[PDB]
Amino acid sequence: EKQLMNVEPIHADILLETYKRKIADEGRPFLAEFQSIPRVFSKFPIKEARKPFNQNKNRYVDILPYDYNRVELSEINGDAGSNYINASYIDGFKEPRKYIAAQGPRDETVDDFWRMIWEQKATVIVMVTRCEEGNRNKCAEYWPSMEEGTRAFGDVVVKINQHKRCPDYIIQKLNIVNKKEKATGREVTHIQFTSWPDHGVPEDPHLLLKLRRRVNAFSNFFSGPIVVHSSAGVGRTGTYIGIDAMLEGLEAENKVDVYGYVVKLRRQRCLMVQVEAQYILIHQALVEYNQFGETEVNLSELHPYLHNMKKRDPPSEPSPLEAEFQRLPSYRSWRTQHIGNQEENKSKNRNSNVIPYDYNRVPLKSKYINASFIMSYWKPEVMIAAQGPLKETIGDFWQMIFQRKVKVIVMLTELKHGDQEICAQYWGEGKQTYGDIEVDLKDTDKSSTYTLRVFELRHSKRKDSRTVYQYQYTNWSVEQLPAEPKELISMIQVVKQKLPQKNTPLLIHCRDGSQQTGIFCALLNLLESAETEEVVDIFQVVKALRKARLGMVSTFEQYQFLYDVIASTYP
């Protein structure tokens, strides 16, 4: 030990604010709290990691395993130092040696990596990194492409059975077996998180509360250690363990000694949590989870779940669902919105207090247009949530759908309510023209549900005609909600099937582009993970929208509606 500090272990309640003050003024409290924890601990000898026959086995000499808790390999007689591998056993909130902090194997080390997985009887590998970063290699690829099917590393034969590529991580299902040994194949689970930058942090803390949700779910048929590794086996990896461990700690004592725990970590493995940001990440991780909890229902249980989520027993009280919706932290004046509020540009907003955040408004190649970028399930795919153009922007509207190369447009409104215009009419029967571009409606197909108009677009630079589809859902007043939902869904079938997957292809609008457009965007995203995972986190999906535009799902009616349709369209 040395002289660090004595930080008071945060209790649930005060966590939210403790956090708030701890971060104030570029979070210098945190900075020091973190700057006090030593890189390494000089007492714990490190004499094996430094031997010569073992120096090619490391990736960076900056990070070396302590001698006392270093993971050892079966000594292969003859081969000098054939017991060393860069990896350290890590203790959890309780379970001692719950994890194994491993440095990403080197090509010169792949074999020794799979040997450690066989010997320690691990059945869960948590890879938090990418093999390549900055045209610099961070981790050798130690597994068979789904295509080569099987590959043996030394005596360890690894056969892949599944490769499920999700938005942030890819989950593989491997089967290993030692072949110079009658023992039988074991079921290995390998998650790879790809939305986590070396030396840095992910886009949102929920992404971490996410893979933690996933790993704590996998089978560990052998009570073996959990292999967590990145490039050096200290940064992102140690950070992960931070969240995981400290989250058990919360669910148990309702307090968390992050500072303490990280020290315990820098005591088991050199410079674990390596960044003030990663340090703060663990906290936000905790704050966020404690704050909103776990809101991700699986398709298996969606129906039963919701039902009770709706029952609000003492009727004198709200429902569990309502509870949730009320937890949804609307991001009021969340970020800068100056642009949309400039003099001349104030007359370009159908709805005054529905201005895109300066942080994502759509640049009008700048120039001002009241539409903003909305995140898509598959990142980085993106949608454009705009408002019904104004007869005084009917032009700019088209210039946007061109520059941004919009393929399909979705109109959720009518053209007006008797007198009151709910939208302009950016399209005519003729060959309408606006600025450097001219539209030309080619087909107008109406159905009892929605009506589809095919446009052909061009600018004086002819022989480029870009066909643009517009779908117009009628059945949906800013009063009621989708009258016949089942068809609002089909509306989405055709829409998604007219978009070419993985280049902004889509654009969705309505009066203000938040009112109904919110429910739409929310559905597209929930429908996607609903297909690619069978898991649905309506809360977070909505929490993201609110974070992008003032307006999305603002009423419980709408909120509860997401649950209804997601549920009813999956018995």
């Binding site: 990736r59 000499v61 900056d62 490039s231 050096a232 200290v234 940064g235």
Partner: peptide, 4 residues
Amino acid sequence: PTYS
């Protein structure tokens, strides 16, 4: 090499 070096991790920093």
